[PDB]
Amino acid sequence: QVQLQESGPGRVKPSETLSLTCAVSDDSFGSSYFYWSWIRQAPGKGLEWIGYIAYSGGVRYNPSLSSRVTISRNIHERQFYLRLTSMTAADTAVYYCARHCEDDYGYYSAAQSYGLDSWGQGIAVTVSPSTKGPSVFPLAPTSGGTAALGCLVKDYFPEPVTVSWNSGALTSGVHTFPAVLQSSGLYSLSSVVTVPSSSLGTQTYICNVNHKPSNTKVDKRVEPK
Amino acid sequence: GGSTNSTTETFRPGGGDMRDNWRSELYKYKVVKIEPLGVAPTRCKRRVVG
Amino acid sequence: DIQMTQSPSSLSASVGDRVTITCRTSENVNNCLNWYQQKPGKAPKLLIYRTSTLQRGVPSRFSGTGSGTDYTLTISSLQSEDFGTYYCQHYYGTPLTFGGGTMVDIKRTVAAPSVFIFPPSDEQLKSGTASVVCLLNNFYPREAKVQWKVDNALQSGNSQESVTEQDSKDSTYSLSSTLTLSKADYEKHKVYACEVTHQGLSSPVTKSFNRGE
Amino acid sequence: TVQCTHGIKPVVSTQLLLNGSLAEEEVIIRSENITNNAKNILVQLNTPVQ
Amino acid sequence: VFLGFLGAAGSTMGAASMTLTVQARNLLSGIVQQQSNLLRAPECQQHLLKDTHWGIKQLQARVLAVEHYLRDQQLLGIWGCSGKLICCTNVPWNSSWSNRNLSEIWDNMTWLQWDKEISNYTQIIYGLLEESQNQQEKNEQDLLAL
Ligand SMILES: *[C@@H]1O[C@H](CO)[C@@H](O[C@@H]2O[C@H](CO)[C@@H](O[C@@H]3O[C@H](CO[C@H]4O[C@H](CO[C@H]5O[C@H](CO)[C@@H](O)[C@H](O)[C@@H]5O)[C@@H](O)[C@H](O[C@H]5O[C@H](CO)[C@@H](O)[C@H](O)[C@@H]5O)[C@@H]4O)[C@@H](O)[C@H](O[C@H]4O[C@H](CO)[C@@H](O)[C@H](O)[C@@H]4O)[C@@H]3O)[C@H](O)[C@H]2NC(C)=O)[C@H](O)[C@H]1NC(C)=O
Ligand SMILES: *[C@@H]1O[C@H](CO)[C@@H](O[C@@H]2O[C@H](CO)[C@@H](O[C@@H]3O[C@H](CO[C@H]4O[C@H](CO)[C@@H](O)[C@H](O)[C@@H]4O)[C@@H](O)[C@H](O[C@H]4O[C@H](CO)[C@@H](O)[C@H](O)[C@@H]4O)[C@@H]3O)[C@H](O)[C@H]2NC(C)=O)[C@H](O)[C@H]1NC(C)=O
Ligand SMILES: *[C@@H]1O[C@H](CO)[C@@H](O[C@@H]2O[C@H](CO)[C@@H](O[C@@H]3O[C@H](CO[C@H]4O[C@H](CO)[C@@H](O)[C@H](O)[C@@H]4O)[C@@H](O)[C@H](O[C@H]4O[C@H](CO)[C@@H](O)[C@H](O)[C@@H]4O)[C@@H]3O)[C@H](O)[C@H]2NC(C)=O)[C@H](O)[C@H]1NC(C)=O
Ligand SMILES: *[C@@H]1O[C@H](CO)[C@@H](O[C@@H]2O[C@H](CO)[C@@H](O)[C@H](O)[C@H]2NC(C)=O)[C@H](O)[C@H]1NC(C)=O
Ligand SMILES: *[C@@H]1O[C@H](CO)[C@@H](O)[C@H](O)[C@H]1NC(C)=O
Ligand SMILES: *[C@@H]1O[C@H](CO)[C@@H](O)[C@H](O)[C@H]1NC(C)=O
C-alpha cells in the first residue's frame, strides 16, 4: 500500500518500447475490487490517466494511446507493469503508479478509498537518441534604469547543467529558468541576472555552464554589442 | 463508451470476476427478514385486568 | 469524452482566508469527483475522494461540495502547508480526466514586471537558428500573458515560455519567453516586438528591436 | 416466496457463461444504472449455443 | 422519569417493583443487537469464523444468554404466570422464611438484601410453587374424568 516501489529505465530512445514495473508491499493486491492505474504528468500541464488494470483483468486504457499501451499484471510476482511502444519525445513525462478501490457493494470490514491514496515515487522518462553538447549564446543589454543580461543554453541533452555567474561570485538578482524541451527532443533554458546601468562595461560578467554528461564546461562573456 | 457523438461504442469480451457469474443466476432472488409485529387501532380496550 | 475546467487558473490568497475553487465538468458525473493537492515535485496527495468524504491524515479545514456538473473545494482557514497546485479528477467510467489546475501561492503586493528584450547572438545566427528572448522579472501574481509580433504580426505555435517559481527574498516570479525561428525567417523581417499584459501595469508594455542596427 | 432457491450450478468461467439458466422469451442485458464505460455487461440468452 | 437499567436496585422493593420492566428490557436489547448481525453481515463476511474459535466462543456466550432467558420463562410458565409480570398464587406464606411485616418489607428493604435473606428457602418455595399448581392440575383433572 504505502510502499509502491517503481523501477525501470529512465532513459529510452525514440521508436523503442518503454516498460515499467510497480511493486506493492502490503499485499492489498489480492483483495478484490481494486484498480491499479498508470498515470503520467507532463510538466506545467495537467495529469493524464493512461490506463488501469482491474482486479479481474485489464479492461481499458486511454483512447488516444489505446493501441500503443499494454498494462500487464503478474499476480504471484506481486507486481504490475506498463508497456508503451513507439516512444516519442512527446511522451517524455513523469510516470506514477496509483491504486484506488471502487466497491459496487460497499460491503467490507472497513471503508475503502475511491480516490488514489497510494502513489509511487515517480520515474522521469526522457526520450532522445543521444546526448548533445550545450550551446551557450550571450544576450546583450543601453538604458537609464538597471539593465539586465543573461545566457542561453540551447540544444543540450540531457539534464542537468550548472550555470553560475562570475564563477560563483554574482548571486543576488540571478534567476535561473526551468528548461524547455523543444520539438527536436533537445533541451533549452535561459539564465539571467539584473545589474545596475552604471556597471555596464565596468564589471566583467561570465556565465559558467558545466554540462555533466558531456563533461563540457563552457564559459562565455556578456557585453553590450 | 466514449462521448464521440455516437461514433464510438465498442463491446469487447471482458474477463470479469466470478461474482458476476453468481449475479447472473441470483438476479431473481432476494433475502428479507420478517418483522411480524404490527400495531393498529381498532377502538377496543381490555378494561378488565388479569 | 468528458473535459474539466478549474476557476481560477491562478490564485493568490492569504493565510486564514476562506478560499474556494470551482471545478466544472462537461457532463453529469453523479457526485463522482476527487480533489488532490500537489506540492511541486512530489506525488499528488489525496484530499477528498468523494463529493464530501474526507480522507484521513487530512486536517478538518477542508471540504468539498457540489453535484451534477459543478463542484467546489473549500478551505475555511488557510495554513502555511496549503500552497502548491490543486487538481480535480472524475472517476465516472473510462477514460479518466483531470482538471487544468489552480496555482495557489501566498498573496503579496502587486509588482510590475521588469521587461527586457534580447536579440539572438551572432554565433547563434551562424548556427542556422534564431531565438529571441523576452524576460519578465519581479511580477505578481503568477498569471500573466506574453505575445510576440514579428513584422507586427502576432506569432503563436512557435513561442516557448518557462517560469521560475516564487522566489525566496521577494516572493515574485520570472518568465522567460523564447521565440524560435529558423535563420531564413530572421532575415526577411526587420521588426521584432514582445508585448506583455500584466495586472500591475496601467497599460500593456512592449519592447522591440531591429535587425542590423 | 420460497424456502430455498433453485438449483444453481457453480460454473467457473471468465469470458462466456456456461451451463446456466436461460431467460424466457427475449434475451436479457444487464448493466448498472450509470452505464458509461464503467460496469461489466451481463448477458443472458434465451437460446443456448453449444 | 425512569432511573435506567437496574436503577432502582438500591430503592425499596416497592419502587423497584414499579420499574421491573426496566430490568426486563436488558434481557432483550442486549440480544437484539447481536442477533441483528446487520453491522456483522458485511465486516469480513461473518467476522472471519474460520480458524477463529473466539468467534464460536463468542457465539457460545450468546447461547448462554438466551438459555438463561428460557430458564426464567420456563419458571413463569410452570407457575401459570407466563403472560404477566406480577402474579398472585395460592401458596400461603410460611412465617419461618421471614418474620418481617409488610410495611418493613416493602418500604424499608431492597430486593438485594431480601434475596439474600431468603436464598436459604428459595428451593422450598419453588417446590410449593410447582406443587401448588398441581392442585389446579387436579381440579382440571376432576373436570376431565367428569
Ligand atoms: C436512596 O435512599 C434514600 C434513603 O435515605 C432515599 O430517600 C428517600 O426517598 C423517598 C422518596 O424517593 C422518601 O419517601 C417519601 O418522602 C416524602 C417526602 O418528600 C418531600 O418531603 C421531604 C421532606 O421535606 C421536609 O422539609 C421541608 C423543609 O426543608 C418542609 O418544607 C417539608 O414540608 C418537609 O417537612 C423533602 O426532602 C422532599 O424532597 C424535595 O423537597 C425539599 C424541600 O422540601 C428539597 O430540599 C429537596 O431537594 C427536594 O426537592 C419532598 O419535598 C414523604 O412525604 C413520603 O411519605 C408520604 O408522603 C407523600 C406525600 O408527600 C406520599 O406521596 C407518599 O406516598 C408517602 O405516603 C415518603 O416518605 C424518603 O423520605 C427518603 N428518605 C430519606 C431522605 O431518608 C432515596 O430515595 C433512595 N434513592 C434510591 C434511588 O433508591
Ligand atoms: C482496434 O482498434 C484500433 C484503434 O481503435 C485499430 O487500430 C487503428 O487502425 C487504423 C487503421 O484502420 C489506424 O489508422 C491508420 O493508421 C496508420 C498508421 O498510423 C501510424 O503511423 C503513421 C506513419 O508512421 C504515423 O504518422 C501515425 O501517427 C501513427 O503512428 C496511418 O498511416 C493511417 O493514415 C492514413 O489512412 C487514413 C485512412 O485509414 C487516412 O484518412 C489518412 O489521411 C492517411 O492517409 C490511419 O491513420 C489507427 O492509427 C489505429 N489505431 C491507433 C490507436 O493507432 C484496429 O484496427 C482495431 N482492430 C482491428 C482488428 O482492426
Ligand atoms: C458436439 O458433439 C455432439 C456429439 O459428438 C454433436 O451432436 C450431434 O447432434 C446432431 C443433431 O442432433 C446429430 O445429428 C444426427 O443426424 C442424424 C441423421 O441421420 C443419419 O445419421 C444417423 C447417425 O447419426 C443414422 O442413424 C441415420 O440412420 C441417418 O443415416 C440423425 O439420425 C440423428 O438422430 C436423429 O434421429 C431421427 C432423425 O429424424 C430423430 O429421432 C431425431 O431428429 C434425432 O435427432 C442426429 O440428429 C449428430 O449425430 C450428433 N453427433 C454425434 C457424433 O452423434 C453436437 O452437434 C456437437 N456440437 C457442436 C457445436 O459441434
Ligand atoms: C434493467 O431495466 C431497468 C428498466 O429499464 C433499468 O432501470 C431503469 O434505468 C433507467 C436509467 O437509469 C431509468 O430511466 C428507469 O426509470 C429505470 N427503470 C427501472 C424500472 O428501474 C435497470 O437499470 C436495468 N438493469 C440492468 C440493465 O442491469
Ligand atoms: C446509480 O446512480 C447514483 C446517482 O445517485 C450513482 O451515485 C451510483 O454510482 C449509480 N450506481 C452505480 C452502480 O454506478
Ligand atoms: C413452616 O414450616 C415449619 C417446618 O418446615 C413449621 O415448623 C412451621 O410451623 C410452619 N409455619 C406455618 C405453617 O405458619
XYZ file of C-alpha atoms in Angstrom, chain C:
213
model
C -15.263 12.462 -23.803
C -15.520 14.454 -20.554
C -13.418 17.590 -20.058
C -12.820 19.558 -16.864
C -12.164 23.210 -16.052
C -10.919 24.978 -12.922
C -11.579 28.552 -11.783
C -9.421 30.477 -11.299
C -6.383 29.350 -13.295
C -4.005 31.202 -10.953
C -4.994 32.234 -7.427
C -3.063 34.130 -4.745
C -4.624 34.124 -1.273
C -3.557 34.980 2.269
C -3.216 32.777 5.337
C -6.522 32.277 7.140
C -8.805 33.262 4.245
C -11.840 31.240 3.179
C -10.820 30.235 -0.352
C -12.958 28.424 -2.927
C -12.048 26.632 -6.163
C -14.611 25.842 -8.870
C -14.357 22.647 -10.937
C -16.802 22.433 -13.855
C -17.436 19.174 -15.716
C -18.833 18.846 -19.230
C -21.311 16.070 -18.383
C -23.175 14.855 -15.313
C -20.831 12.745 -13.175
C -23.286 11.841 -10.355
C -21.283 13.059 -7.340
C -18.197 11.168 -8.616
C -15.224 13.506 -8.213
C -11.910 13.652 -6.343
C -9.764 16.592 -5.211
C -5.969 16.378 -4.953
C -3.151 18.551 -3.613
C 0.317 18.606 -5.185
C 3.293 20.483 -3.855
C 5.586 20.901 -6.892
C 7.918 17.928 -7.327
C 6.064 15.402 -5.153
C 3.374 12.868 -5.948
C -0.180 14.295 -5.704
C -1.505 13.657 -2.206
C -5.175 12.701 -1.917
C -7.534 15.215 -0.285
C -11.217 14.270 -0.795
C -12.004 11.010 -2.602
C -15.773 11.537 -2.886
C -18.016 14.591 -3.078
C -17.796 15.370 0.649
C -15.908 12.441 2.227
C -12.603 13.490 3.794
C -9.597 11.181 3.862
C -7.525 10.575 6.969
C -4.265 12.294 7.713
C -6.091 15.360 6.353
C -6.965 18.232 8.733
C -10.561 19.291 9.286
C -10.199 22.661 7.496
C -11.010 21.170 4.074
C -14.358 20.386 2.476
C -15.876 19.580 -0.912
C -19.411 20.160 -2.201
C -21.424 20.143 -5.417
C -23.484 17.901 -7.664
C -24.227 17.334 -11.330
C -21.714 19.404 -13.296
C -20.476 21.903 -10.667
C -18.246 21.135 -7.679
C -16.452 23.325 -5.150
C -13.458 22.740 -2.902
C -13.402 24.992 0.155
C -10.893 25.863 2.888
C -12.327 27.648 5.926
C -8.971 28.657 7.441
C -5.872 28.524 5.256
C -2.454 27.492 6.576
C 1.200 27.543 5.550
C 1.387 23.982 4.196
C -1.502 24.683 1.794
C 0.427 26.168 -1.142
C 1.018 24.482 -4.489
C -1.233 23.319 -7.300
C -4.663 21.725 -6.794
C -6.470 19.439 -9.239
C -9.837 17.750 -9.673
C -10.487 14.376 -11.296
C -13.627 12.435 -12.198
C -13.816 8.643 -11.933
C -17.135 8.290 -13.816
C -16.058 5.462 -16.094
C -13.285 5.224 -18.710
C -11.412 7.282 -19.562
C -10.407 9.367 -16.535
C -9.877 13.119 -16.877
C -8.056 15.754 -14.827
C -8.611 19.471 -14.446
C -6.224 22.130 -15.656
C -5.055 23.058 -12.169
C -5.076 26.032 -9.789
C -1.701 27.544 -8.892
C -2.167 28.727 -5.304
C 0.701 30.727 -3.809
C 0.727 33.211 -0.934
C -0.546 36.744 -1.502
C 1.816 39.684 -1.998
C 1.789 43.332 -3.016
C 1.303 43.695 -6.768
C 4.621 44.395 -8.501
C 5.025 45.177 -12.187
C 7.398 43.062 -14.302
C 10.755 44.474 -15.382
C 10.561 43.576 -19.072
C 13.718 43.249 -21.178
C 14.364 42.064 -24.735
C 17.406 40.193 -26.058
C 18.366 39.592 -29.706
C 19.990 36.396 -30.996
C 23.757 36.368 -30.658
C 25.824 36.399 -33.836
C 27.200 32.910 -33.160
C 23.661 31.534 -32.919
C 22.871 33.253 -36.223
C 25.700 31.165 -37.685
C 24.066 28.016 -36.237
C 21.116 28.253 -38.639
C 18.648 29.028 -35.840
C 17.500 32.254 -34.181
C 15.997 32.503 -30.688
C 14.842 35.879 -29.352
C 14.473 36.155 -25.573
C 11.853 38.198 -23.700
C 12.201 38.481 -19.920
C 9.735 39.269 -17.134
C 11.226 39.848 -13.694
C 9.717 40.549 -10.270
C 5.997 40.340 -11.112
C 2.990 39.052 -9.162
C 0.663 37.214 -9.342
C 1.736 34.220 -11.419
C -0.937 34.747 -14.081
C 0.292 36.888 -16.981
C 0.365 36.734 -20.781
C 3.110 37.220 -23.378
C 2.676 37.896 -27.096
C 5.147 38.069 -29.986
C 4.927 40.378 -33.019
C 7.228 39.639 -35.977
C 6.808 42.461 -38.511
C 3.744 43.477 -36.455
C 2.185 40.008 -36.904
C 1.187 38.019 -33.823
C 3.108 34.741 -33.556
C 1.696 31.595 -31.955
C 2.753 27.961 -32.051
C 6.478 28.835 -32.047
C 6.611 30.802 -28.765
C 8.073 28.779 -25.901
C 7.828 30.031 -22.330
C 9.239 28.995 -18.959
C 8.606 30.325 -15.459
C 10.636 30.181 -12.267
C 8.850 29.517 -9.006
C 8.020 32.136 -6.394
C 11.402 33.439 -5.270
C 12.502 33.496 -1.634
C 13.647 37.061 -0.914
C 10.816 38.886 -2.707
C 8.229 36.140 -3.454
C 7.962 37.158 -7.111
C 8.062 35.198 -10.360
C 10.134 35.360 -13.532
C 9.060 34.283 -17.025
C 11.415 33.734 -19.977
C 9.577 33.606 -23.302
C 11.751 32.174 -26.092
C 10.669 32.707 -29.707
C 12.442 30.246 -32.010
C 12.582 30.729 -35.783
C 14.929 29.458 -38.475
C 17.756 31.542 -39.926
C 15.647 32.289 -43.015
C 12.744 33.738 -41.001
C 15.101 36.158 -39.214
C 16.450 37.989 -42.281
C 13.240 38.750 -44.203
C 11.788 40.536 -41.140
C 13.384 43.610 -39.548
C 10.785 44.348 -36.824
C 10.574 42.272 -33.632
C 8.309 43.272 -30.732
C 7.378 41.494 -27.486
C 4.124 42.525 -25.787
C 3.302 41.775 -22.138
C -0.059 42.141 -20.372
C 0.086 42.212 -16.569
C -2.120 43.376 -13.707
C 0.321 45.800 -12.062
C 0.513 47.763 -15.321
C -1.749 50.657 -16.280
C -1.250 49.648 -19.953
C 0.242 46.749 -21.956
C 4.003 47.229 -22.344
C 6.012 46.395 -25.475
C 9.780 46.237 -26.025
C 11.184 45.881 -29.539
C 14.373 45.930 -31.602
C 15.522 45.889 -35.230
C 17.922 43.786 -37.302
C 21.350 45.182 -38.142
C 21.318 48.344 -36.015
